[PDB]
Design an enzyme around this catalytic site. Structure first.
Site, PDB file in Angstrom:
ATOM      1  N   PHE A 100      -3.377   5.900   1.116  1.00  0.00           N
ATOM      2  CA  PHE A 100      -4.623   5.146   1.145  1.00  0.00           C
ATOM      3  C   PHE A 100      -4.611   4.133   2.290  1.00  0.00           C
ATOM      4  CE2 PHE A 100      -7.490   1.985  -1.368  1.00  0.00           C
ATOM      5  CZ  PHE A 100      -8.549   2.264  -0.510  1.00  0.00           C
ATOM      6  N   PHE A 125      -6.961  -4.575   6.115  1.00  0.00           N
ATOM      7  CA  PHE A 125      -6.123  -3.450   5.746  1.00  0.00           C
ATOM      8  C   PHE A 125      -6.072  -2.481   6.911  1.00  0.00           C
ATOM      9  CE2 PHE A 125      -9.434  -0.197   4.693  1.00  0.00           C
ATOM     10  CZ  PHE A 125     -10.544  -1.006   4.634  1.00  0.00           C
ATOM     11  N   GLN A 141      -2.388  -3.429   2.994  1.00  0.00           N
ATOM     12  CA  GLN A 141      -3.292  -4.574   2.986  1.00  0.00           C
ATOM     13  C   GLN A 141      -2.505  -5.869   3.079  1.00  0.00           C
ATOM     14  OE1 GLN A 141      -5.612  -4.828  -0.570  1.00  0.00           O
ATOM     15  NE2 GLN A 141      -6.626  -6.766   0.008  1.00  0.00           N
ATOM     16  N   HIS A 194     -16.871  -2.160   4.308  1.00  0.00           N
ATOM     17  CA  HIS A 194     -15.809  -2.851   5.024  1.00  0.00           C
ATOM     18  C   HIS A 194     -16.024  -2.691   6.520  1.00  0.00           C
ATOM     19  CE1 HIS A 194     -13.312  -3.671   1.438  1.00  0.00           C
ATOM     20  NE2 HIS A 194     -13.840  -2.544   0.993  1.00  0.00           N
ATOM     21  N   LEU A 220     -15.435   3.931   2.012  1.00  0.00           N
ATOM     22  CA  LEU A 220     -15.484   2.515   2.344  1.00  0.00           C
ATOM     23  C   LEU A 220     -16.517   2.192   3.409  1.00  0.00           C
ATOM     24  CD1 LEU A 220     -11.686   1.620   2.374  1.00  0.00           C
ATOM     25  CD2 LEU A 220     -13.345   1.462   0.474  1.00  0.00           C
ATOM     26  N   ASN A 275     -12.452  -7.517   1.580  1.00  0.00           N
ATOM     27  CA  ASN A 275     -13.471  -8.481   1.178  1.00  0.00           C
ATOM     28  C   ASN A 275     -13.595  -8.453  -0.344  1.00  0.00           C
ATOM     29  OD1 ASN A 275     -15.495  -6.480   0.416  1.00  0.00           O
ATOM     30  ND2 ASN A 275     -15.805  -6.096   2.614  1.00  0.00           N
ATOM     31  N   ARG A 300      -0.467  -5.554  -0.852  1.00  0.00           N
ATOM     32  CA  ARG A 300      -0.892  -4.357  -1.580  1.00  0.00           C
ATOM     33  C   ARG A 300      -0.681  -3.156  -0.673  1.00  0.00           C
ATOM     34  NH1 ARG A 300      -6.431  -1.969  -4.307  1.00  0.00           N
ATOM     35  NH2 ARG A 300      -5.366  -1.181  -6.186  1.00  0.00           N
TER      36      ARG A 300
END
Length: 180
Positions: A76, A129, A79, A142, A138, A118, A71
């Protein structure tokens, strides 16, 4: 006798990925891990880089080698780290099952940070990531445990091969990995 004044977690271990894109070598990303501050999380990532724990409980190597960046989202993060199904829905930690969130003390203040993917509280496995922007929303969800120390240009190149939804427009693989 202390001699340094650091405004960040100290780097205590260094590891690397060699990246392939559509089967061609694309360079090396090097990471610094924050093992003084999140040792269990750092140790999980380090061991998955070396493969030294051998086979996991799901019939797959406890090793990032061969796993894709599944991903990839411009502006952003990117991942990867699904070492079981290799498609983004799986993963396994060196601890035999998912493991607890070790600490949220280190926040997503900027690009180039290594953080655990997660599926909710205390579900850390192998997926991770790398941020490409500050991601403060986040924080508290995370676990940040390291940072890019070389090859951020490679991270940016990978990022440019993504899409708003995250489906990559190329096949990006950790062709090799290890500890420095």
């Amino acid at each position: 006798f202390a001699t340094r004044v650091i405004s960040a977690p100290k780097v205590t271990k260094k590891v690397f990925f060699k990246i392939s894109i559509n089967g061609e070598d694309a360079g090396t990303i090097k990471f610094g891990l924050f093992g003084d501050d999140v040792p269990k999380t750092a140790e999980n990532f380090r061991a998955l880089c070396t493969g030294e724990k051998g086979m996991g409980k799901l019939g797959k190597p406890l090793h990032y080698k061969g796993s894709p960046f599944h991903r990839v989202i411009p502006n952003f993060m990117i991942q990867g780290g699904d070492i079981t199904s290799g498609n983004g829905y799986g993963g396994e930690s060196i601890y035999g099952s998912k493991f607890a969130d070790e600490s949220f003390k280190i926040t997503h203040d900027g690009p180039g940070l290594l953080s655990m993917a997660n599926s909710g509280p205390n579900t850390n496995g192998s997926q991770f990531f790398i941020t490409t922007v500050p991601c403060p929303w986040l924080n508290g969800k995370h676990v940040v445990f390291g940072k890019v120390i070389e090859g951020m240009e490679i991270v940016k190149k990978i990022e440019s091969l993504g899409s708003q939804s995250g489906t990559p427009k190329a096949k990006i693989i950790i062709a090799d990995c290890g500890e420095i």
